[PDB]
From a paper:
Papain-like protease (PLpro) is an attractive drug target for SARS-CoV-2 because it is essential for viral replication, cleaving viral poly-proteins pp1a and pp1ab, and has de-ubiquitylation and de-ISGylation activities, affecting innate immune responses. Based on recent findings and knowledge of SARS-CoV PLpro function, PLpro is an active enzymatic domain of non-structural protein 3 (Nsp3). The PLpro core has a domain architecture that resembles human de-ubiquitinases from the USP family and comprises “thumb”, “palm” and “fingers” domains. The active site residues are found on a flat surface, split among the thumb (Cys111) and palm (His272 and Asp286) domains, while the fingers domain contains a zinc binding site coordinated by Cys189, Cys192, Cys224, and Cys226 that is required for overall structural integrity.
M208W performed similarly to wildtype PLpro against each substrate. M208A appeared similarly stable to wildtype PLpro, while M208W strikingly increases the protein melting temperature by over 5 °C, indicating a substantial improvement in thermal stability. We set up parallel crystallization screens with M208A, M208W and wildtype PLpro, all with intact catalytic sites. M208W readily crystallized (in 14/96 conditions), but we were unable to recover diffraction-grade crystals of M208A or wildtype PLpro. After minimal optimization of screening conditions, we collected a 2.00 Å dataset of M208W with space group and unit cell dimensions (P21212; unit cell 58 Å, 85.5 Å, 83 Å, 90°, 90°, 90°) that were unique compared to other PLpro structures in the PDB. The Trp at position 208 had clear electron density and was accommodated without disturbing neighboring residues. Overlay of the M208W structure with PLpro: Ub, PLpro: ISG15 and PLpro:3k structures indicated that this mutation does not introduce steric clashes with ISG15 or 3k. We examined B-factors to determine the extent to which the M208W mutation stabilized local PLpro structure. In contrast, increased stability in M208W PLpro extended along the whole β-sheet of the fingers domain and propagated into the α-helices of the palm domain that pack against this sheet. The area of stabilization encompassed the 3k binding site and may provide a mechanism for improved 3k sensitivity by reducing flexibility without perturbing structure.
Author numbering: -2 to 315
Write the structure that this text describes.
């Protein structure tokens, strides 16, 4: 008989839904045949096919027309490096633990993931619909307790790697861009005794996010901002249409009072070397810190984001 190649049968994919049958040469690396290749997040680019690999599914980079279409439609990304960064993160997040704390999926602390835990807890408490099929799929999986893919996707979408220190407000900003916030609208009015008044309408992400004040009530009453003429002007909320709002500000000692907010991010410590915790208002106040939970009737600490429920609001200010 003539000398012949040994092969096995595997599937490749970019979305784990459309599987593509491949015959691989056992004498070559996966990289030699597919380019960068991943097995449940593990980089097997330099590995030759094992007999145990037969029938398994491998993730590859979108390097042909079919895979580019499938990656673009599933992930809503134009970045060729997306699949690689996602799988590199999944290799770690699949090893994290995701305890249920107070009825929510949290993350046990690892790899400086405190900002991810507080973001994950927050996402389970505000009404959000993600546009990428990958995010909406992984999110439901996260609510059921299996958050590893959702966490690796958040890292990919935010261009962060495992172990990098993160920021909740920036994370929320990246994710909100992938959310359907089309019916979200905010109308603001800015009043200066000299220059008069000017109204502004904001839609989408800019209608739900605000930087500089934690108190939604204070935003309704009016916040002092500098105006172009050197006098402090007053900016106040005229109309809001959204299922929630997110008020953020530099970490500052702040009292959280039960029933007046949905949840909040505490940041202790110094700039870019501190620690996030999550505070949620249920029947009392719950402080979720990864796997850890404490309860209290009152809470005061260095708060940096507060989330509030909303539906429709219209000022009574003339
Ligand atoms: Zn002015």
């Amino acid at each position: 008989g003539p000398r012949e190649v040994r092969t096995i049968k595997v599937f490749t994919t970019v979305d784990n839904i459309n599987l593509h049958t491949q015959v691989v040469d056992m004498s070559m690396t996966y990289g030699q045949q597919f380019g960068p290749t991943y097995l449940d997040g593990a980089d097997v680019t330099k590995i030759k096919p094992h007999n145990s690999h037969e029938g398994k599914t491998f993730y590859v980079l979108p390097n042909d027309d079919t895979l580019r279409v499938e990656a673009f439609e599933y992930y809503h990304t134009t970045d060729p490096s997306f699949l690689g960064r996602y799988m590199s993160a999944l290799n770690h997040t699949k090893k994290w633990k995701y305890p249920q704390v107070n009825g929510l999926t949290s993350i046990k602390w690892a790899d400086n993931n405190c900002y991810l835990a507080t973001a994950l807890l927050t996402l389970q408490q505000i009404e959000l619909k993600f546009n990428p099929p990958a995010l909406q799929d992984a999110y439901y999986r996260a609510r059921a307790g299996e958050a590893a893919n959702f966490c690796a996707l958040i890292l990919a979408y935010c261009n962060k790697t495992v172990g990098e220190l993160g920021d909740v407000r920036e994370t929320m900003s990246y994710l909100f861009q992938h959310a359907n916030l089309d019916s979200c609208k905010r109308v603001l009015n800015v009043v200066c005794k000299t220059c008069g008044q000017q109204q502004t309408t904001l839609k989408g992400v800019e209608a739900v996010m605000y930087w500089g004040t934690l108190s939604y009530e204070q935003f309704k009453k009016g916040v002092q901002i500098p105006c172009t003429c050197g006098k402090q002007a007053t900016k106040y909320l005229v109309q809001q249409e959204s299922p929630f709002v997110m008020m953020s500000a530099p970490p500052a000692q702040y009292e959280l009072k039960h029933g007046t907010f949905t949840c909040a991010s505490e940041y202790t410590g110094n700039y870019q070397c501190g620690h996030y915790k999550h505070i949620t208002s249920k029947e009392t106040l719950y402080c979720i810190d990864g796997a850890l939970l404490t309860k209290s009737s009152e809470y005061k600490g260095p708060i940096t984001d507060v989330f509030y429920k909303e539906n429709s609001y219209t000022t009574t200010i003339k």
